[PDB]
Amino acid sequence: AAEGYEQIEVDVVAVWKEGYVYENRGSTSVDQKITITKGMKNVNSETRTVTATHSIGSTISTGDAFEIGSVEVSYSHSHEESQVSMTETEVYESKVIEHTITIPPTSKFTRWQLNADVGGADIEYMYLIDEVTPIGGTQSIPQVITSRAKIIVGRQIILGKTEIRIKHAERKEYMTVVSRKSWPAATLGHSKLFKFVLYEDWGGFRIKTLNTMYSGYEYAYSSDQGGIYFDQGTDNPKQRWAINKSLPLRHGDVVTFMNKYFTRSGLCYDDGPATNVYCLDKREDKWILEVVG
Ligand SMILES: CCCCCCCCCCCCCCCCCC(=O)N[C@@H](COP(=O)(O)OCC[N+](C)(C)C)[C@H](C)O
């Protein structure tokens, strides 16, 4: 939808449910109260980005960040095929609806409830249909023909090609390359000139800097003392990292880089003497990946 994002339509799991049913076996109308809440359960409000609980085809894997642009369902009721679309402002809103009803004599009122599981997100009462039929008379069961959703996610980071920036989530600072002990060393900064390229091989992920002052020494790695420097490409697991998120990596992803040799140590911030980007034991700081325009 926005600069650096892509909208993808995808098939979603939608289901009807008898939301409310009142069987008026007696003569004259009887009144009861009923209230519903149309919208997504446990909406963050501070953000519309939803992390996945379960998959959505091949596009969305678990733990992936997406945004629901819309949800579209096609339903067949009483031999009458129609369809309803739910805009983005409707899914992330908690719309509360309340009202009493007077059911006709010797009749069964039915309010069918439609819900959606768009990658974990439980959109309750997407739609409803108030069907009323006499007691005994076979009512129509609404079926789902095609349930789909339009989701926004972030441009795909093509490994070994797309140039990105690796920002600290908490400090909102970019990871830069400075000199430390005559070697390229990682440290936080505000400069948006420090770009990187992510690779992946048998040994894990690699972080190739494009801004090394010592040419050739360009792959981020953890030393034995814990600090982060850049070295020439080798099969050394100290320059290999493990990302918590599943592939593919997209723009705006929030990830944690865990070293492959120092399996319990992860890429983090630590007020050091010369630099502040380290790879320390029992530490798993979050970093934001973002594509350059
Ligand atoms: C003239 C003489 C008159 C006397 C003659 C005798 C006739 C009497 C018989 C009348 C009985 C009618 C049947 C009773 C109505 C049942 C109501 C019902 O089934 N519906 C439920 C539907 O669940 P929810 O809407 O809560 O979904 C909640 C969904 N969540 C998971 C999001 C929370 C609700 C609670 O109400």
Numbering used by the authors: 5 to 297
Published text:
Lysenin from the earthworm Eisenia fetida is a pore-forming protein that specifically interacts with sphingomyelin (SM) and may confer innate immunity against parasites by attacking their membranes (Bruhn et al., 2006; Cooper et al., 2001). The structure reveals that lysenin has two domains. The topology of the lysenin structural fold establishes it as a member of the aerolysin family of pore-forming proteins (Szczesny et al., 2011), which appears thus to be conserved from bacteria to annelids. Here we report the crystal structure of lysenin alone, and in complex with the sphingomyelin headgroup phosphocholine (POC), and with SM itself.
The crystal structure of lysenin bound to sphingomyelin (SM) was determined in the spacegroup C2 by molecular replacement. The crystals exhibited two molecules in the asymmetric unit, one bound to SM and one not. The SM-bound copy has a different conformation in subdomain 1 of the PFM to the protein structure without SM bound, because it has opened up into a more loosely packed arrangement. To our knowledge, this is the first crystal structure of SM bound to a protein and it shows simultaneous recognition of hydrophilic and hydrophobic portions of the lipid. A binding site for the lipid head group at the top of the PFM is partnered by interaction with one of the two hydrophobic tails of a pair of aromatic residues on the edge of a β sheet. The SM binding site is the most striking feature, because the fatty acid moiety of the lipid flanks the edge β strand 2 of the PFM the way an additional polypeptide strand would. Residues Glu128, Gln117, and Lys21 interact with the SM head group, making a hydrophilic binding site, and the main-chain CO group of Gly23 interacts with the phosphate moiety at the SM head by hydrogen bonding. The single SM hydrophobic tail resolved is held nearly parallel to a β strand of the PFM by the side chains of Tyr24 and Tyr26, which form van der Waals interactions with the SM tail, creating a sort of aromatic platform to hold the tail in place.
